[PDB]
Design a protein around this ligand. Structure first.
Ligand SMILES: *[C@@H](O)[C@H](C[C@@H]1CCNC1=O)NC(=O)[C@H](CC1CCCCC1)NC(=O)OCc1ccccc1
Length: 174
Protein backbone atom coordinates (compact mmCIF):
# COMPACT_ATOMS: atom_id res chain seq x y z
CA UNK A 1 0.00 0.00 0.00
CA UNK A 2 1.26 3.45 -1.00
CA UNK A 3 0.27 6.50 0.99
CA UNK A 4 -1.50 9.05 -1.25
CA UNK A 5 -0.45 12.71 -1.64
CA UNK A 6 -3.09 14.03 0.78
CA UNK A 7 -1.81 11.70 3.49
CA UNK A 8 1.75 12.92 3.00
CA UNK A 9 0.42 16.50 3.12
CA UNK A 10 -0.54 15.93 6.77
CA UNK A 11 3.15 15.49 7.65
CA UNK A 12 4.36 18.93 8.70
CA UNK A 13 7.73 20.27 9.75
CA UNK A 14 7.63 21.17 13.45
CA UNK A 15 10.36 22.03 15.91
CA UNK A 16 13.34 19.69 15.59
CA UNK A 17 11.21 17.17 13.72
CA UNK A 18 7.72 16.70 12.34
CA UNK A 19 4.10 16.30 13.29
CA UNK A 20 0.91 15.04 11.72
CA UNK A 21 -2.55 16.56 11.15
CA UNK A 22 -5.12 13.95 12.22
CA UNK A 23 -7.95 16.38 11.45
CA UNK A 24 -8.43 20.10 10.78
CA UNK A 25 -7.83 20.87 14.49
CA UNK A 26 -5.76 17.95 15.83
CA UNK A 27 -1.97 17.73 15.42
CA UNK A 28 0.19 14.98 16.93
CA UNK A 29 3.96 14.92 17.39
CA UNK A 30 6.72 13.53 19.58
CA UNK A 31 7.20 15.48 22.79
CA UNK A 32 10.96 16.00 22.59
CA UNK A 33 10.74 17.77 19.20
CA UNK A 34 8.19 20.37 20.41
CA UNK A 35 9.71 23.87 20.70
CA UNK A 36 10.09 25.28 24.20
CA UNK A 37 10.25 28.94 25.06
CA UNK A 38 7.53 29.90 22.58
CA UNK A 39 4.22 31.67 23.09
CA UNK A 40 2.42 30.19 20.07
CA UNK A 41 2.29 27.26 17.67
CA UNK A 42 1.33 27.91 14.04
CA UNK A 43 0.51 31.46 15.12
CA UNK A 44 -2.03 30.41 17.78
CA UNK A 45 -1.40 31.40 21.43
CA UNK A 46 -0.82 28.46 23.74
CA UNK A 47 -3.85 29.25 25.87
CA UNK A 48 -6.03 28.73 22.74
CA UNK A 49 -4.71 25.18 22.37
CA UNK A 50 -5.58 22.08 24.38
CA UNK A 51 -2.15 20.45 24.80
CA UNK A 52 -2.11 16.81 25.95
CA UNK A 53 1.34 15.33 26.60
CA UNK A 54 1.63 11.72 27.74
CA UNK A 55 5.29 10.77 27.79
CA UNK A 56 6.68 11.14 24.29
CA UNK A 57 3.21 11.49 22.72
CA UNK A 58 1.95 15.07 22.29
CA UNK A 59 -1.46 16.04 20.90
CA UNK A 60 -2.57 19.60 20.16
CA UNK A 61 -6.24 20.49 19.68
CA UNK A 62 -6.51 23.99 18.26
CA UNK A 63 -9.49 26.30 18.74
CA UNK A 64 -9.67 27.16 15.05
CA UNK A 65 -9.57 25.05 11.94
CA UNK A 66 -5.92 24.94 10.92
CA UNK A 67 -6.29 22.42 8.08
CA UNK A 68 -9.91 22.75 6.97
CA UNK A 69 -8.96 21.01 3.72
CA UNK A 70 -8.57 17.68 5.58
CA UNK A 71 -11.08 15.09 6.67
CA UNK A 72 -10.64 13.59 10.08
CA UNK A 73 -8.89 10.25 10.21
CA UNK A 74 -8.64 7.57 12.89
CA UNK A 75 -5.87 7.74 15.50
CA UNK A 76 -5.42 4.49 17.43
CA UNK A 77 -3.09 3.49 20.27
CA UNK A 78 -0.56 1.46 18.36
CA UNK A 79 -1.56 -1.52 16.25
CA UNK A 80 -1.78 -5.31 16.64
CA UNK A 81 1.47 -7.21 16.86
CA UNK A 82 2.67 -8.17 13.41
CA UNK A 83 0.97 -5.31 11.57
CA UNK A 84 3.12 -3.85 8.81
CA UNK A 85 3.05 -0.08 9.07
CA UNK A 86 4.58 2.65 6.96
CA UNK A 87 6.58 5.39 8.66
CA UNK A 88 5.95 8.50 6.53
CA UNK A 89 9.37 10.11 6.80
CA UNK A 90 9.88 13.49 5.19
CA UNK A 91 13.44 14.74 5.00
CA UNK A 92 14.43 18.39 5.24
CA UNK A 93 15.29 18.35 1.50
CA UNK A 94 11.68 17.42 0.65
CA UNK A 95 12.47 13.76 -0.04
CA UNK A 96 9.81 11.22 0.94
CA UNK A 97 11.07 8.01 2.50
CA UNK A 98 8.24 5.68 3.47
CA UNK A 99 9.73 2.90 5.59
CA UNK A 100 8.02 -0.45 6.12
CA UNK A 101 8.08 -1.65 9.74
CA UNK A 102 6.64 -4.85 11.23
CA UNK A 103 5.25 -3.79 14.57
CA UNK A 104 5.84 -5.49 17.88
CA UNK A 105 4.89 -5.08 21.50
CA UNK A 106 3.37 -2.05 23.16
CA UNK A 107 5.30 -1.36 26.36
CA UNK A 108 6.86 1.26 28.63
CA UNK A 109 10.55 1.03 27.66
CA UNK A 110 13.59 2.81 29.06
CA UNK A 111 15.20 4.90 26.32
CA UNK A 112 17.96 7.46 26.95
CA UNK A 113 17.22 7.53 30.66
CA UNK A 114 13.44 7.87 30.56
CA UNK A 115 10.48 5.55 30.47
CA UNK A 116 8.66 5.85 27.12
CA UNK A 117 5.23 4.37 26.38
CA UNK A 118 5.44 3.19 22.80
CA UNK A 119 5.53 0.34 20.34
CA UNK A 120 8.71 -1.15 18.91
CA UNK A 121 9.02 -2.54 15.41
CA UNK A 122 11.48 -4.07 12.96
CA UNK A 123 12.44 -2.17 9.84
CA UNK A 124 11.84 -4.29 6.78
CA UNK A 125 17.95 3.18 4.54
CA UNK A 126 16.68 3.81 8.06
CA UNK A 127 15.70 6.63 10.40
CA UNK A 128 18.03 9.49 11.33
CA UNK A 129 18.20 12.51 13.62
CA UNK A 130 15.54 14.92 12.47
CA UNK A 131 12.92 12.26 11.66
CA UNK A 132 11.08 12.26 14.98
CA UNK A 133 7.36 12.95 14.83
CA UNK A 134 6.88 11.13 11.52
CA UNK A 135 3.62 9.15 11.63
CA UNK A 136 3.26 5.37 11.70
CA UNK A 137 0.29 4.51 9.50
CA UNK A 138 -1.39 1.47 8.07
CA UNK A 139 -4.23 0.84 5.67
CA UNK A 140 -7.51 -0.60 6.95
CA UNK A 141 -9.82 -1.35 4.07
CA UNK A 142 -9.92 1.77 1.92
CA UNK A 143 -8.81 4.12 4.72
CA UNK A 144 -5.54 4.89 6.44
CA UNK A 145 -5.13 4.86 10.23
CA UNK A 146 -2.40 6.59 12.25
CA UNK A 147 -1.14 4.85 15.36
CA UNK A 148 2.12 6.43 16.54
CA UNK A 149 4.81 9.06 16.00
CA UNK A 150 8.49 8.28 15.50
CA UNK A 151 10.55 8.57 18.70
CA UNK A 152 13.68 6.40 18.76
CA UNK A 153 15.74 3.64 17.22
CA UNK A 154 18.60 1.34 18.05
CA UNK A 155 22.10 2.43 17.11
CA UNK A 156 22.06 -0.25 14.39
CA UNK A 157 18.76 1.20 13.13
CA UNK A 158 16.99 -2.17 12.74
CA UNK A 159 14.54 -1.59 15.63
CA UNK A 160 12.42 1.58 15.76
CA UNK A 161 10.01 2.90 18.38
CA UNK A 162 6.93 5.07 17.94
CA UNK A 163 5.35 6.84 20.84
CA UNK A 164 1.66 6.01 21.23
CA UNK A 165 -1.25 7.50 23.12
CA UNK A 166 -1.52 6.66 26.79
CA UNK A 167 -3.69 3.72 27.70
CA UNK A 168 -3.42 0.31 29.27
CA UNK A 169 -5.15 -2.79 28.05
CA UNK A 170 -4.85 -6.48 27.69
CA UNK A 171 -2.69 -6.50 24.53
CA UNK A 172 0.04 -4.23 25.94
CA UNK A 173 2.79 -5.19 28.35
CA UNK A 174 2.17 -3.89 31.89
C1 LIG B 1 14.34 11.82 16.61
O1 LIG B 1 14.54 12.93 17.42
C2 LIG B 1 15.39 10.82 16.93
C3 LIG B 1 15.38 9.71 15.92
C4 LIG B 1 16.51 8.63 16.10
C5 LIG B 1 17.89 9.23 16.01
C6 LIG B 1 18.73 8.07 15.47
N1 LIG B 1 17.80 7.20 14.73
C7 LIG B 1 16.46 7.55 15.09
O2 LIG B 1 15.50 6.98 14.63
N2 LIG B 1 15.20 10.27 18.26
C8 LIG B 1 16.22 10.27 19.25
O3 LIG B 1 17.32 10.74 19.03
C9 LIG B 1 15.87 9.68 20.55
C10 LIG B 1 15.46 10.80 21.48
C11 LIG B 1 14.94 10.43 22.89
C12 LIG B 1 13.78 9.49 22.82
C13 LIG B 1 13.23 9.17 24.16
C14 LIG B 1 12.86 10.45 24.87
C15 LIG B 1 13.98 11.41 24.96
C16 LIG B 1 14.61 11.69 23.62
N3 LIG B 1 17.02 9.05 21.10
C17 LIG B 1 17.33 7.71 20.58
O4 LIG B 1 16.75 7.20 19.62
O5 LIG B 1 18.53 7.21 21.06
C18 LIG B 1 19.09 6.05 20.53
C19 LIG B 1 20.30 6.28 19.66
C20 LIG B 1 20.27 5.86 18.35
C21 LIG B 1 21.37 6.08 17.53
C22 LIG B 1 22.50 6.73 18.04
C23 LIG B 1 22.54 7.14 19.35
C24 LIG B 1 21.43 6.93 20.17
Amino acid sequence: HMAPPTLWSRVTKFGSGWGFWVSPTVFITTTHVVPTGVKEFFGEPLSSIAIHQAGEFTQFRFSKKMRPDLTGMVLEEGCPEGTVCSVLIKRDSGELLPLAVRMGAIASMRIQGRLVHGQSGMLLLGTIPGDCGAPYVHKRGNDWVVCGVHAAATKSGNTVVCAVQAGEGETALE
